[PDB]
Each structure stands twice: as C-alpha cells, then as structure tokens.
C-alpha cells in the first residue's frame, strides 16, 4: 500500500509548538551532556579513555544533528492559515536523525565495551562486529524509512524494517555475549553496574523501532508529533542516562585499578 | 475568554528597541557568565564539581536560547509604517525561554543540592524529585502559555498556571526541606550562605509567575515589552547572582575540607 | 526640535566602505584581544583573577557586538544608485553598541578595582556603586539616543544626555576616590601604573560623549561615518589599551606578592 | 567529446536523500575524528607531535569542507516536480572537496613521514617533495575536473587526469622510498605497522581516481550519487582509519623511546 | 584617467572557480595554521610568548577575513548566462583583506621583534613605530584602492600608492635597523635564522604591491582572478612560512636560555 510520509503532514500550531520544544530541548540537553563530558574527563583513567572519546563523539554528533533539525524545522514548514504546511525542507527535520544514529549507535557499542573486560582478538572481533552490525541496523532503517519509496511505501518499510531488525539482533547478541563473558572478571559492584548499563542500552534500542511502526501504520500530524516526541525523548534518556552510567562504571574501574 | 497572545502584538519602534536591548543584554551577560565559570572552575574541589557542571550547563543552554531569540526577534517582526508587526516567527521570540527553563530550573536545583550535605538514598531521592518537579513546573507552564489554546485562551492559562504552581510547591518544599536538614551539618559561615542561596533561588522563582499573570490579564505591545524586560532581567539576576553565590559556598566548602 | 537619526542617513559608497572597515577592524582587534587574554592568563595570580575574568568578559561581549554590527551593516543598507540607503535593520548597526557598553563599562570598573587595594565593606560597596553607576550611565544614554523619540528628538537627547552625564560623574568619583585611597598602599611602581590606568580609563570615557554631541548637533552621512570611526577607534584604544595596562599592573602585583 | 558535469544532473528524491546522508555522515565522522584527536593528543611524545598537528589539520579542514558542502547541497538543488534540479550553487557541492584534498593530501604525507625515521636534508627534501607532489596531484585534478572546460569536456579531463596521475606517481614513489629506508631502523612491531600504514594510504589514494573515471565516462543522477558515496566513504575510511593507525605507530614509538 | 574596479568585472565560470578555490584554500590553510599554533604553544618560553600571541592573532584575524570573503564571494556574484556578474556585495570579496592586513602587518612586525634582542626605550620605541608604520601602510592603501574614487580612479590609486609606499619604507627601515642591531647579540644559529626571517618578511611585503599595480594598470576578469590568486598565495606563504620560522627561532632561543 502507500502511507503518507511523516514529513508530508501539515501540523497544527500546537503540534508545531510541541515539535519545536522537543527538538530544542533535546539539542540543549545534548549540549549540556557535551559540557558535562569535558568537565569530568579527568575522573577516568587512560585505560578507559575510549569511554571519554565515545561519549564525546556521541554528544558532538547528536548536538549538531539537533541544531540542524531545529534550523530545518524553522525553515521547513510554512504557515498557511491555521496550519503549518510542510515545505520541501521538511524531510530535513527527520532525516538528520539517521545521520546521528549512524555514528552514535556504533559508538554506544564501543562505549559499553570499553568498561567491559576484553582483550586481543576477542576484543577487536567483538568491536568490529558491534560497530558493523549497529551501522547497518541504522542504514537499512534509513533506506526503508526515507530513501526507498520516499518513505511513502508500506511494502518498503516492512522489508527494511525486517532487515534492520535482523542486524539489531546480530548486534545485540554480540554485545550481550561479551558483557556476560566480562561480568565474572569484574568486581561485584562494577559487574552490577555493567549489567544495568547493558539492560538500559538494549531497552533504549527497543523504543526507537516503535517510532518506525507509527510510520508504517499511522499517518497524520499527531503522528508526526508523536514520532518527534518519542525519538527526542529516547535520545535524551539514552544518550544522557547511559553515557552517565558508563562513566560511573569507568570511574569505579579507574579507582579499583589504583587500589592495586 | 480569549486574550491575544504575547507574540501577536505589534510593537512601537521604542518597544522594538527596548525588547532587543534586553534580549541582547541577557544573552551577553549569560555569555560572560559562561566565561567566568570556565576561568574559575579550578577554585572548586572535585567533591563539588557538580556545581561547576550545573553552572556551565545553565549558562550554555541560556546563552543559546537568547541567541536564538535575538535572531528570531530580528526576523520575526516586519516594519509596517510606524509599528513592527509580528510575523509567524514571532512566537520563536518567547517560546525558546521555556526550552531554556526546562534544562535550567532542574540544574539550578541540582546546583543548590551540590553544596548542601546529603548522601545515599536521601540524596538520590531528593535530586530526582527536584529535577522531576522542576521540569514539570516548566513544561506545564509551556502547555498553558504556548501550546494549548495558542496562548490566546484565558481558561487554558489558568488551568495550567495552577498545575504549574502545584509542581512549583512540590519542588520548592523538597529543596527547602533538604537545605534545612543540611544547614546543621555545615560550618556557620557556609550555612549562612546556603540559607541566603535558598532564599534567593526561591525568591527568583517567584518573579517568573508574575509574567504569566500579565499574559492572562493584560495584552498589548507595552505588555509584550514588560514580559521581556521582566523575564530577561530575572534571568540575568537569578542565573548570574545565584550561580555566583553557590560557587562562593562551594569554594568555602572546598577550603574547609582542605583544612581537615 | 528634531534631527534625523544617525541610522537614517544614506551613505556614499566611500562612507559605506569606511564604515565597514572600522566595524570589521574593531571586531578583529577585539578578537585578538580575546586570544591574547586567554594565552596570557597564567601570568596573573588567583588574587587578581577578577582581572582575567573581567578582561575576558569585555572582549567576548565586544567581539559579538561587532560581529552582529558587521552583519547588520551588511544587511541594513541597500544600494540605490550611487548611495546606500538605510533599511529598517540599519538601527542594528549602532544600537548593539549600547548592549556591549552596558556589560563592558561595568566590567572595566571591576577590572580597575581588582588591581587596586580594597577590602571588606569598602570593596563591596565601591564595586556595587561603580557597577550600578556605570550601567545607568549607559542605559540612560541608550534611552535618549535610541529608544525615546526614536533618536530623532533633540529635546530627548539633551535630557538623557544630562541624566547620563550625572551617572558618569557619580561613577567617576567613586572609582577616582577608591584609586586615590588605594595608591598609598601599593608599591611606587604599581601605584604609578594604577594612576595611569585611572587617567586612561576616565579619558577614554570622555571621548564617547563626543559622539552623542554629533547626534545632537549634526546630521548626515559624513556624521554617521564620523560616529562610527570615533566610537570604533575609542573601543579599540580603550578596550585593548586599558585592559593591557591592568594586566601589567596585575602581573606586577602578582610578583610582588611572590617576593613575600 | 562532451559530457554533462557531475553537478548538472537532476537528482531523484532518493538520490537527493542518499547524497545528503553521506555528506552529513562524513562531516559528522570527521568531527568525531577531530574530537578523538584532541582528547588523545597526550599519548604522543613531542618528537612525534607533528603527527598530532597533521591529524588535527586534516580533520579541521575536512570538517569545514563537509559542512560547506552540506549547506551548499541544501541550497544548491531546487525541487521541481519529482526531481531536484541543480541550481548554480550545485558546483559548490563537489568543488569544495578539492580545497580539502589540497591541504589534506599534503598533510597525510607529512603525518606518514612523522612516524618514519628520517633526518637532516633527507627529511626536509622528502617532505617538500611529498607536499609539493601531493598538492599538484590535487590541483591538476581540480583544473581538469572543474576549472578547465567547466567539467564538461572529456578531452580536458583526460589531459589533466594524466598530469594528475604523473604527480601521483612521483609523490607515491617518494613516500614509498622513504618508508622502505625507514623500515630497517624501526622496531619490528613499529615497522610492521608502518608497512601497513603505507599500504593503506596508497590504497586509499587509488580509490579517488575511480570517481574521476566516472566523470569522464558516465553521466547522470545515479553517477552523481555514486561519486558522492564513493568519495565520502573514501574520506571516512582513509582519514579516520589511517590517522588512527599513525597514532598507534606514534604511541608505540613514544613508549619505545621512554624505555631507552 | 579611470579604470574599472577589481570587483566590477564579470567573471567567467573558470575564473569564478579559480577565485573560490584560492579563497577557500587560503582560509583552510590559515585555520590549520591556527591549530598548529595552539598545539605547539608549549615549545616556546614565557620570554617569547609574544610570538605565540602574535601568531595566534594573525591566524585568527586572517581566518575570519577569509571566511567572510568566501561567503561574500558566494553571495556577491550572480550567474547571468555564461558569466558571473558582480552584485553590490562583490566589493566585500576584496575589501576584507585590508581589514585583515591592518591587524596582521602590525602583528608580523611585533612577532619579528619578539625573537630579536631589544630592551627598554629602544624596544618600546621600535615596536610603536613599526606598528604605527605598518598600520598606515595598509590604511593608506585601503583609501587609494577602495575608499577614494571607489577604486576606479587611477589618479587616486597613484597618490595613495605612493603614500602607502612611503610608510612601507619607514616601517621596513625600522624593522631592518632593529634586526641588524639584534643580530650580534644572538647565537650564530639564531642570528642566521633571524636574518632569513627578516628577508622573508620583507620579500613577502614586496609581492602585495604588485597586486595594486594590476589594479592601476590592468582591468578585467582575468585580472580580478590574478589579484586573488596572487594575494591569496602570498598570504598562505607569508603567514604560514614566516610564522613557522619565528617559532623555530623562538624555540631555539628558549632552549639556549634553558642551557644557561
Ligand atoms: C542515540 C540514539 C540511539 C541509541 C538510536 C538507536 C536506534 C535504533 C536502535 C534503531 C533501530 C531500528 C530498528 C532495529 C528497526 C526499525 C528501524 C530502526 C533504525 C529505528
Ligand atoms: C534561569 C531561569 C529560571 C530560574 C526560571 C524559572 C522559572 C519558573 C520558576 C517558572 C514558574 C512558573 C510557574 C510556577 C507558574 C506559571 C508558569 C511558570 C513556568 C512561569
Ligand atoms: C568599551 C566601551 C566603553 C569604555 C564605553 C564607554 C562609554 C561611555 C562612558 C559613555 C558615556 C555617555 C555619556 C556619559 C553621555 C552621553 C551618552 C553616553 C552613553 C555615550
Ligand atoms: C582525505 C582525502 C584524500 C586522501 C584524498 C586523496 C585524493 C587523491 C589521491 C586524488 C587523486 C586524483 C588522481 C591521481 C587522478 C585525477 C583525480 C584525483 C585528483 C582524484
Ligand atoms: C598577512 C598579510 C600581509 C603580510 C600583508 C602585507 C601587505 C602589504 C605589505 C601591503 C603593501 C602595500 C603597499 C606598500 C603599496 C600599496 C599597496 C599595499 C597597501 C598593498
Ligand atoms: C553504499 C550505499 C548504497 C545505497 C544504495 C541504495 C539504493 C537505493 C535505490 C532507490 C531507487 C528507487
Ligand atoms: C493535537 C496535539 C497532538 C499531540 C501529540 C502528543 C503525542 C504524545 C506522544 C507521547
Ligand atoms: C511528553 C508528552 C507531551 C504531550 C503534550 C500533549 C499536548 C496536547 C496538546 C493538544 C492541543 C489541542
Ligand atoms: C526596566 C527598563 C524600563 C525602561 C523604560 C523605558 C520607557 C520608554 C518609553 C517610550 C515612550 C515613547
Ligand atoms: C573622526 C574622523 C571622521 C572622518 C569622517 C570621514 C567621512 C568622509 C565622507 C566622504
Ligand atoms: C597558481 C596559478 C593557477 C593558475 C591556473 C590557470 C588556469 C587557467 C584556466 C583557463 C580557462 C579557459
Ligand atoms: C557504490 C555507489 C552506489 C550508488 C548507488 C546510487 C543509486 C541511486 C538510485 C538510482
Ligand atoms: C581614522 C580616520 C580615518 C578617516 C579617513 C578619511 C577618508 C575620507 C575619504 C573621503 C572620500 C570622498 C570621495
Ligand atoms: C598569478 C597567476 C594568475 C593566473 C590567472 C588565470 C586566469 C584565467 C582566466 C581564464
């Protein structure tokens, strides 16, 4: 069949207000996350500096994405009466997220692995698989949702949703395997935290698919608003929550080593 | 009933001048506040680094908000004779404040708690309540004032004003409780300062509601000007004044620990 | 009576060239001043860090003001034949200075006081008076010159010129008093420098009123050009000259303390 | 003969989506590369600081280029029905790469040489030849592909392709010679890595010519998309991959010296 | 007589391509120069920190100038057939250089003097003369070439060319005198380098007048292209070459002092 695309829906003034607030709120929160990261980079040892590097990368990429989306949103809808009618630049209010996720879902994997205990081939092989898996999960989603069928084709969405979902599972398994192998070799406290971090990351990765279902199934202004609110909030929660948790695991691990 | 929205009023050239000066002055003052924060971050110990992190976050978010509002203001009113007539981008001269406050009212709570003495569950429980309470105070206000009724509906303003005000009290009580519990465990000097900081923060949070009353009751260019001047000044005073006070408390506390 | 405002005059191509060069030259010089400040912030002791903080603030605010004025100037005049005719954005080529001065005339006062010897109430009371006096000197000027009468009313200019001038004297007296009290307690060398710094600051503050007289008395393109050249040069000289002098005093004072 | 230029092709909405994603993804990845570089610059000794300087330069230049290309791309095609028709600014979506490569192909040469063992005239003479050779390889390509014939002339492309290719070989030989001379004087581990780095750099420099062949031979929207995807990916891989490898070599060399 | 100004010539697409590449290449190279400067500021002692300050200033000012010229160039010519016709904002593609040179020709003088041996009045008197001389050399050139006669008057160009040239000689003599006095008091190695630096700076200052001769004598698109290429290259060579040389002298002098 053929659903309308999420960036083709005219927005009521309320919906144009909500959609701006969450775009601006997310970009603001990610910029605070960047500043927190830089001000507290000294608390973590050089062994776990990959965490600092990843967290910074996630925040820098995500902050720019959300700046571009606020500017695209400002120039992507035109007021025509009581409604904001999408322009041609309206696709640049939702499509930039996939650019951000492409860099940030791989880095979140690397940031999780950084606190976990892995060495040699096992380390390298895990990282590459997790990066590769995560990137494809996102790129295949981008093809289905934006590129192929112009995001108006239900058939396309489903095929690439499935493909996307396969690469999710591949990627999830790899990260879950590695953490489980790494939990025994950690102090109880660390291993407790790293079990929580893994659950939080995987639970966060579960929300985003929901917003792809909206696109396959529902279509309208409220649904465009709901896709923004859902995805914006998920970013704020996952990117700020999980990255904080990993720094706690990494600060703890830093000290444990100093003890020894 | 139905009042006109604050961003729907045509401004006299005087009012368009005043409104710019205070938008630019506030953004300038907040940028100095950011630079002060970075140049003097070494005076505080790692125990109270949360203060540095919060203060930076408040200043970065607020500086961007006020940059966007000056640019929106520049492109949001069109001169038509002797008056500046608002465009559709004029709502982006007042609505960005709620994005800023959403991140900065929670952080001001965290910054106050950072100098106060609290630990364990009590700490976590207090912080989350204060963050959650503060965010809702702001978001409910944003719904009433901008999203619901397009900020033209007196009925909506009142309902969400009330709701907003409930979450204010919840949030205030939590912060006031915690400081009162924390005052005994501090040196007289510190506790003196932290009593002042609490009064200043709560007194500052009392001014902003005033500007919501203007919107419910009065409507016109002078009132749009008065809402900007009021809110801009309150930001400059609270954000620069209170954040300075907390660094003084945090610097003092840092030293006290050193002499122990 | 009535005079045309300084931003209502059509400019000859020569005058549009000169006026750009000095706007860009001043903003460039202030940006170098910022970089000098950051590269040489280590030469000053923590006792006089309120000089580094002030100097940075002056430079950051002034650099943004002059960026906005170059961009406003680029978009504020339209070429119509042989002359550049001012738009409605032309007022944003002169009005941003008052935003800059509002933050920078108070900070220059604080920066002077930082090297001088003041303690306790005397210190606090002096600083607040100097900040408050300096801000009102600028804001009252802004009312007379831009806000009240649209800067076309000779009567308004004179009233607020006078008011402005009252607050100048108040502010000057306070700063001059404090330095005179502080000169005896300093080493001869320092006190020599601090006497020069005070003269330079007060002499610099004398030039700016000249450009308000042009507005009261003369009107035309040559006069708009002369108001830019005068004010731009005064900024470059005062902001870069005086701030350098204070760092010399502050560096000297830092050493004196070390040798004790 | 004559071919349409790569920036003269109308793009399908899919192709306009793909082409944006890879422009934004590359600029995001290069910005992460910059942040990684600055967070990990302490791991390298002052002997090999040239590496840090080069890597930073590569990333700063490349990040700006790709920002300009995303903004040019946003303003360089106009939607006309089902297709995006190139404007006059469309040439600024492909031409900025040559500006980036002009600075970054020379620096990649310098970064390779920095870890290798070379001294005195031999060092200076090698660097200058490699810089000069690399710059001409790029500039001659820019003449053929953009400046001469407006990138529509097959004859021009071939002449400058050849010239370009001559300077490639000159440059390659010089870098390959120097590394071969340098491999014996390095520790086995280092020399292993530096052999890989040389292969990776030269292999990366082999991909870019492919995109020049497309231009000579094929012409159309899919080919414009294929030139972006090819060149964007090559940048991400070479700039992030090779620069990482050199830091590994540089970190290793740093330690080896510490041992001694 | 009368000649067309350099920014009044319509450019062929080739010439519009070349002129962009060199504007973007110069701005990119100056930004790398800034990053090099910051990454290697630790190699020089506090005695010669003026060098670091100058070099940074030169690079910051020049990088902004060339950003504002690439953006002016993008918005200063309109495609009209096969040619790019200059608009009104085309003078802002050549006039910003004089703003840059006004700050950077004085600083280059200060940077040369920083590594040379001068003290007391001789130092102060030399610096002020060199700064003053250099600024007037540039400003008088700006009057002749841009402001007076709109850069269309051969008579004006010649008068101010001559005046400009007088201040060049004054400035050159002062710098050459001081270096000659300073060469004896330096180690042979340092003095060798400082002799080269002086030749390089004065030789660089000789090229720029050539581009003023083009304007007096020749007029056309090729000549506009030749003025950009000449001036852009001269900036890249002088600003990056000379500033590097001075850091070498300054690093050497730093060490010499350490070994004493
Ligand atoms: C900071 C942003 C994060 C953590 C983003 C995560 C996004 C995903 C895990 C997306 C997953 C998807 C599927 C597995 C199926 C449908 C398409 C996607 C891309 C939304
Ligand atoms: C830096 C900005 C600060 C401290 C902002 C504070 C804002 C408030 C405390 C706002 C309170 C409100 C109410 C309790 C009722 C009406 C709606 C609000 C949001 C203005
Ligand atoms: C960095 C900028 C500085 C030091 C600006 C100083 C400006 C003044 C001292 C302005 C004084 C004025 C009067 C006392 C009367 C007329 C109005 C003013 C504001 C120009
Ligand atoms: C970071 C970017 C890099 C490493 C770019 C490298 C580009 C080249 C080695 C380009 C080579 C070319 C030829 C030898 C043939 C003609 C076309 C060129 C310029 C693409
Ligand atoms: C970084 C830029 C530099 C070193 C610029 C130097 C420019 C000059 C030395 C200009 C000299 C000129 C004359 C002496 C004659 C007339 C033309 C001028 C103004 C370009
Ligand atoms: C390397 C990335 C390649 C992506 C290919 C996507 C092709 C989509 C074609 C859409 C046609 C309608
Ligand atoms: C009409 C207003 C639409 C609001 C949509 C809210 C979506 C909430 C998702 C969680
Ligand atoms: C987080 C979820 C936000 C939901 C906001 C709902 C607003 C509804 C507005 C209805 C307008 C008619
Ligand atoms: C607080 C700042 C208040 C400024 C008041 C200025 C009033 C101007 C009135 C203009 C009337 C015409
Ligand atoms: C202070 C000097 C002001 C000079 C102004 C020159 C104006 C020229 C007009 C053609
Ligand atoms: C550094 C000098 C570069 C000169 C390039 C010359 C290109 C000539 C183009 C001619 C077009 C017809
Ligand atoms: C490797 C590059 C592949 C590019 C494919 C682009 C297809 C565009 C859709 C037609
Ligand atoms: C510092 C003051 C600079 C003044 C420059 C004066 C230039 C006057 C040019 C007049 C042009 C008339 C056509
Ligand atoms: C300094 C060399 C200048 C070369 C200019 C080339 C102009 C090309 C016009 C076609």
Author numbering:
A (entry chain B), B (entry chain C), C (entry chain D), D (entry chain A), E (entry chain E): 3 to 262
What do the paper's sentences say?
Here, we describe a rhodopsin group found in microorganisms from cold environments, such as glaciers, denoted as CryoRhodopsins (CryoRs). A distinguishing feature of the group is the presence of a buried arginine residue close to the cytoplasmic face. Combining single-particle cryo–electron microscopy and x-ray crystallography with rhodopsin activation by light, we demonstrate that the arginine stabilizes an ultraviolet (UV)–absorbing intermediate of an extremely slow CryoRhodopsin photocycle. Our data suggest that CryoRs are sensors for UV irradiation and are also capable of inward proton translocation modulated by UV light.
Among the studied CryoRs, CryoR1 shows several unique spectroscopic features, both in steady-state and time-resolved experiments. Notably, one rhodopsin (CryoR1 from Cryobacterium levicorallinum) has several absorption maxima over a wide range of pH values and showed a 80-nm red shift to 620 nm below pH 6. Specifically, at pH < 6, the spectrum is dominated by the red-shifted band at 620 nm. In contrast to many known MRs, the pH-dependent spectral shift of CryoR1 is not observed in a continuous movement across the spectral range but rather in a gradual decrease of the red-shifted absorption maximum at 620 nm associated with a rise of the blue-shifted absorption maximum at 540 to 550 nm and the deprotonated RSB band (400 nm). Furthermore, CryoR1 exhibits strong coherent oscillations on the ultrafast timescale in its 620-nm absorbing state at low pH indicating a hindered isomerization of the retinal chromophore. The strength of the coherent oscillations suggests a hindered retinal isomerization after excitation, in agreement with the extremely small signal amplitudes of the K state. Therefore, the unique large spectral shift shown for CryoR1 cannot be simply described by the protonation of the RSB counterions, and the molecular basis of this shift is further described in the “Protonation states of the counterions in CryoRs” section of the Supplementary Text.
